Amino acid sequence: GVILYGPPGTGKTLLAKAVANQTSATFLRVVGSELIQKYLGDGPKLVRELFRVAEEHAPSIVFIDEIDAIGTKRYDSNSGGEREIQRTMLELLNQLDGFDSRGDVKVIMATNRIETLDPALIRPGRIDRKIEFPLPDEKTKKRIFQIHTSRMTLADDVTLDDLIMAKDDLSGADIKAICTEAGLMALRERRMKVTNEDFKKSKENVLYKKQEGTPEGL
Amino acid sequence: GYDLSASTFSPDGRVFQVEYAMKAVENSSTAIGIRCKDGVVFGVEKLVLSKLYEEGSNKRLFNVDRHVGMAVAGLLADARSLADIAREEASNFRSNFGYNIPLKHLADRVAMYVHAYTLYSAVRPFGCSFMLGSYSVNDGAQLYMIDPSGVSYGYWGCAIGKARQAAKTEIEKLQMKEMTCRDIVKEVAKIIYIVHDEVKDKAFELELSWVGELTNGRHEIVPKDIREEAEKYAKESLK
Amino acid sequence: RGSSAGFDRHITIFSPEGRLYQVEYAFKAINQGGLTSVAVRGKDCAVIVTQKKVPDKLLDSSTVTHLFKITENIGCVMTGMTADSRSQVQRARYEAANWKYKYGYEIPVDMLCKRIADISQVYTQNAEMRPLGCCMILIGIDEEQGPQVYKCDPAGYYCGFKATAAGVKQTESTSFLEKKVKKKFDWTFEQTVETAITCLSTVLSIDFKPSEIEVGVVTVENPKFRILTEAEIDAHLVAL
Amino acid sequence: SYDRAITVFSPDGHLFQVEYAQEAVKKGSTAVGVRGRDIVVLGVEKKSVAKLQDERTVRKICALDDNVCMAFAGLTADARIVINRARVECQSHRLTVEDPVTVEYITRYIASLKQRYTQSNGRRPFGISALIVGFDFDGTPRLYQTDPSGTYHAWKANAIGRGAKSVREFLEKNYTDEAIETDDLTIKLVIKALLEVVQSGGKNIELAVMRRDQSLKILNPEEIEKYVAEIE
Amino acid sequence: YRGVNTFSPEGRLFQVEYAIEAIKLGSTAIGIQTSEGVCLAVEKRITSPLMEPSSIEKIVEIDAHIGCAMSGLIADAKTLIDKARVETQNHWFTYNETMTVESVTQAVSNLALQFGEEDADPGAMSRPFGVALLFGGVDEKGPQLFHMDPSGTFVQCDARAIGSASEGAQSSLQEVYHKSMTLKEAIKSSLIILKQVMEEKLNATNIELATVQPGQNFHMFTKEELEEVIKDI
Amino acid sequence: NQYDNDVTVWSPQGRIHQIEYAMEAVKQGSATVGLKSKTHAVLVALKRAQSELAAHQKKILHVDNHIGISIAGLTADARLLCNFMRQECLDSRFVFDRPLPVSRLVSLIGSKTQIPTQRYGRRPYGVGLLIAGYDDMGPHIFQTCPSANYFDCRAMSIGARSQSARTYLERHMSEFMECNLNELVKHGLRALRETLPAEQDLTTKNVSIGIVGKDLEFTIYDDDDVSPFLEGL
Amino acid sequence: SRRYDSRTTIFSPEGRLYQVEYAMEAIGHAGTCLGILANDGVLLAAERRNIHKLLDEVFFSEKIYKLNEDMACSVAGITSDANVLTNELRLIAQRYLLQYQEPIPCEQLVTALCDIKQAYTQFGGKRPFGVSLLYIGWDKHYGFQLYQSDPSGNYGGWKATCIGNNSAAAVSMLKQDYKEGEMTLKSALALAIKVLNKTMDVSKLSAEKVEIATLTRENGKTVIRVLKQKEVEQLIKKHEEEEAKAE
Amino acid sequence: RGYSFSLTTFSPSGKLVQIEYALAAVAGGAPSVGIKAANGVVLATEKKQKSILYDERSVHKVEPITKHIGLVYSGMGPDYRVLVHRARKLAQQYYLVYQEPIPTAQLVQRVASVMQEYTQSGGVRPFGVSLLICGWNEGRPYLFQSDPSGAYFAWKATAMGKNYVNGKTFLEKRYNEDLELEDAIHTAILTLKESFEGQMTEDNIEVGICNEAGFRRLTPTEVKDYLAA
């Protein structure tokens, strides 16, 4: 199996969807928050049935997005739904590698936060490959900007290089939001083309969502 | 988690840490003490954990003062610490006021010292019960007992340890208010043998002490000859 | 109503509603002893009466007592945990002696209750130690105020009183005394002892004999605190 | 007196409070220092001028004495406390030994202070790493680095703070006797290394230069821009 | 939770066990005792080429006749070394003699494990020291080698290896060491083992070697001497 | 699992787990035996070495001219207790110019060791002792526990696999009073031998003996000094 | 006891001081305080958070405190904690005057207080002072000055800054419309009114929710004044007119 | 020995919950009122005992501090006594140094600093009590409030305790700048009457005033007196 880990907004789900659409096998997607059921045993039953209808469908790919919800360090001293989440994780562990042969099923997992997962959950025999997704640096940024502005008429004054040059830890999701908001505000102003000032103001608005404390930690 | 410190009340108003301390006292071998007209007599069921121990080892009878005795049950280490405290209180009283400490006052001072250890989380309750006995012509025979909670009362015959209930039943038939120390010593030995469980515990040694007119008001170990007579009487009684 | 957040139930820190659960438990501990006491103020006397339970003949009944003499003219009765009450009695004696040494006259009953209340209040504010689970009632004759009866509790509340109870049947005794207090005077004679003994006898349904209660009184004519002997108690019991 | 053991060992033999203090150093702004033949240079990247802050009161390079200066990376308040403790010690050493402090001595003092806070009761480790540069009385240039753990070493050139791994990688390949041949060449090496991480360049970096006899000198914005222009 | 002075179910203090675990993170250090003298060797473990190897001091001199090799949390050992130096000079000042190696080890070991949280001191140590020390020197009894652990336990040893490669370094020392070994053989054997365990290639700049002999004082080999020995090794 | 993390926390069964664990530390220690006769008190201990090239850890220490101890447990705590005992013996000689009676020395130990077992943040002393001494009342053998309790014995053994030794001492207890010094020591060695794990024999490198008598100040025999006693067993 | 201890002076897994972070988040809600440095003076403008028909007017101000003959400060956060720090500031400044017989320079006074705050965040087991302060003053070394401090014990000099509610918008506006090196006390006052007008979304400037203090040098002596109601209203009216004329 | 760590700590959103709960205890306390007239101040409180047995005159809620300062509370009674003792101690310390009665503002500041210390010191909880302090200094009346957090405010009229929201809304409608002490006393009694749940008697409430003559607690004769109107 493969686990995709990286900071939030780098393209884990994007790559999973791309392989899903480009592959010839039954692709199944489940978000970890959907395995936190409200009745005892239903999380384990859901994982059991998810892997049950994955051998019934020939080659298959089971992509459990946001595993961090169900998988965790597994601290014994906890009470409440933590025990049920742990039992769901144990059932998933057994399905991934246990007494029975797994047939022909491939597992993909994505997690913004991999350090809090269970070593038993991401041990080699369970997940072999571990792919790191880094934040775009200098030219991947230009590529995403072009890709997301492809179907959008732009005026001949767009300094995309000026937009990307800043070392603002910008993410691909941030770039997509920038493009969408720039288009939206052009539409609001009634214009027929997006302007460099529109892009700059959209970028400033997007980066306004930072928060935190300045002196703290630095 | 209401029973993890002595500085927290339970929902119903109980200090479980103190209660557990008494529970430890309830696992020790029984020790009894009977007050009579002439004086006071103490007796202890000392189990022989190993045959390699010397006779008199881990003695559970102490002389806190030249006129005051002390019998203990429970954790021995805590008991010895309290005996040192009682000696300190008795010595300090004589230096300050110039005469032997009354037994009632000595019991009160030690009880308050014990009670001070059931109010804070920085210390734990003494896991031991003990009894103080003395005799003076002016005050007569006096016997007291103190528990982990720090409560002290006067008694005519007291028991502490494993077989507290059985010993109390036996003590009820003695009619100690009009008996002498010589006769009481035999009775104290008899009771200890009856309450003891030979099936459970392997063997025990009987430790005896007394204080009264016959000893001139000084607590001391019972003479070997008298102890031998008392042991023979108790064994003969157990037909 | 009973929400909890953190250690409000383990130490003396405010509950979400603004409660001190540990203080409340100290009140609940006062009823562990199983005893009840009553104090009633007369026209020119004060009387305190409490139960006396000797579980077996082996106990020396003489030492089993809940009435104490704080000073020559002040006496008290304690309820709740035995060890806690004795420690508070020692502190009251020390405080009264200190007052006499420092200011040159005997400590008024209200001031003694106030001093003990202040000491208790420290326990409920500081988290290092639990509150004493015991209650004190003080009786004495004031120079220009007649008889006095005061009561202080674990929290530090120390209001004065005309009639009072404490223990298992505090509620029933309080109602009984209030009814009597409402009628004419809650007794206005040295036979105020009869009112107290009747109040205690009524709630517990005991029909006391001479060796099941202890009485302590102070009178204007004889301000010294005294403990009535079993003979005198029997005389009052037969009269009623 | 609060006397709890803040710093204690953990399974596998780790001091999490020390490691957390290190991740606190890593969040700070980048700082670079190189030891030249007859000059020691300290550089630091400014997160943002803000156009409103008074730059005089936000200096991350401070002079411990006439012959020693340091730059830190981590909690600003913690650094100010450590800097003051070093300053009093430098004067105290002058008073007793009657000679100026050596860079190794003051580095040892600061490191011992940091180590003490990792083993004391009721105390938090210092969340800063310092680069101390200066000239010994013999005239040999010196450059030292201290970590929150209390360890210190002597470096030809090192970087601390955010993105320190890349700057250190750049310095390792680009440090040579030829590069430090001249004082101007040494300064350009620091500027180029900083430009590896910081974006704007020139307007986002502060530089301090210490020579053998001359005291600490802070390069003016015009001088920094000229060096940046020469670099490109 | 889990105060520093806590006992595990097997009777082993948690903090001491963790401190001993911290020793395995240190670089390897070897010490051999011979009738001719005592030699100490330690891998410097240079992290990056820009660091100056001369500033890594894992072998220090306590007195003219005592030397110490350190492994573990090197910052912790600074206080232990300072105590040893002060104790040695106090003994000379009082008795006008030189402390024995065992007495110096004993004084340092007593300092270790004197940590506490409640009713100890205004600023007492909160944790044990995470360093294992090898004391080498020559006393009235001749060459002496002592090993001290974080648990405050010290013992004389003919040859002892500590650090990340202690298991395997000790194995080699077992096969080679013998009582009649000379100082030259001891230095060669120590270097051979160090070269084997070290991940990096052994050279004159990334290791430290010192010796103490009945005649000469504590001596730390310079580069020229180090190059000579490794050439044969 | 919440009543075994502090020494001031009673458990529901009226037991303090922390004290129980400290008692478990001395069990992991190495074996040691102590017996007495009408004239002499003897201590024999089995020393063990961490490695083949490390000296065997010493187990018998001096306290005064008439008192000695054998330790089994945490050595650092043993040195702290031994230091306390030596000071108490010294103070008695300084003030009263008289040896401190053994029983009174043991009572002082119990008082000191009890305090940690009742205060928050403190721990019991993780060491057991076998005190052998001679006073005006004759030979004495005492046993101390991490719980501040002591027993006046006539023959006792503590440490790992010490039950086999205690079995021997009880079987032959009737002979110790009237045997000579050579016979008494052999009895101590035979018991220690029983503790040994089958395929192993007592050796001059792992056996240490301590003797105190009516006209014999406390002495410790180690190395070749033990050969006269071993010859004959 | 270890169980009940909060551990207010430890590091988080990502090397963060949570108690300091929370304390700063507490200041984020308090009344807005504004400081502007001009060529011939400094000023402090603070939102008078307490507003009730029954509150009486006592003292010369509610949030502006005088520290020396040539210094003053405003606070934002826990009022009780602020009173503790303002008293310490007065003591520190007088101790310096006693030692040197010269008024304490403004930068030194800020550093002395920030040292106290830093100690609270490092050792002691106590909660940090949940207060942030703005200082204005004059000294012979650097003339008019304006400083800011945070619970962490960190401070910095500013030409114009804000802390409290809607600080982000306030600083964003100040950054845009601040003419460094060419601002008089009169344009500074007008800028303060405009910033306060938008920052306090609730209602508008009533001349009762605003307290303004200005520091200037007259005849060689520092003068600290709190603007009266008549002049504060006059400023608001002028701001209203200018806003009207623009539209 | 005593815990050295603060029990009051910042919450994730920046609130001091322990101070929040101390105010909740004050809120559930007994109602209190204070009105600053043109020539004096008045403090009033409800003193509803639990039954006929309690002695109404045994313990007072309106306790003087000096010849010109008095205060009342709403919250826990035991905590009020501690602060009253500290307040009297501070007033005398001031007088010893300056040979002048402590001004009302100064006393409030010092008392407030004491309450603040219990929100930061180690092993203590906040005073679950709010104080109202009245004074007459420099020919002017003063009325102050001091909360558990240690913050103090100057009031022309205010109320605390149960249903203090309605009490303040009531006071706002009825207040007037030029009131007279007699009208202030009458309004103060009525404010309490708003939420009293029973018949108000001279034994069921307590009143005190402060003016040029000085602070003094009104006798039950006068309290009944005013009640009649």
Ligand SMILES: Nc1ncnc2c1ncn2[C@@H]1O[C@H](COP(=O)(O)OP(=O)(O)OP(=O)(O)O)[C@@H](O)[C@H]1O
């Ligand atoms: N390299 C990229 N190329 C194109 N689009 C990208 C890239 N990186 C991110 N995006 C955009 O990011 C948006 C957010 O979804 P994405 O799959 O990237 O999230 P993610 O990395 O899985 O994040 P999370 O960890 O929060 O689940 C996608 O719609 C995609 O448009």
Ligand SMILES: [Mg+2]
């Ligand atoms: Mg995703």
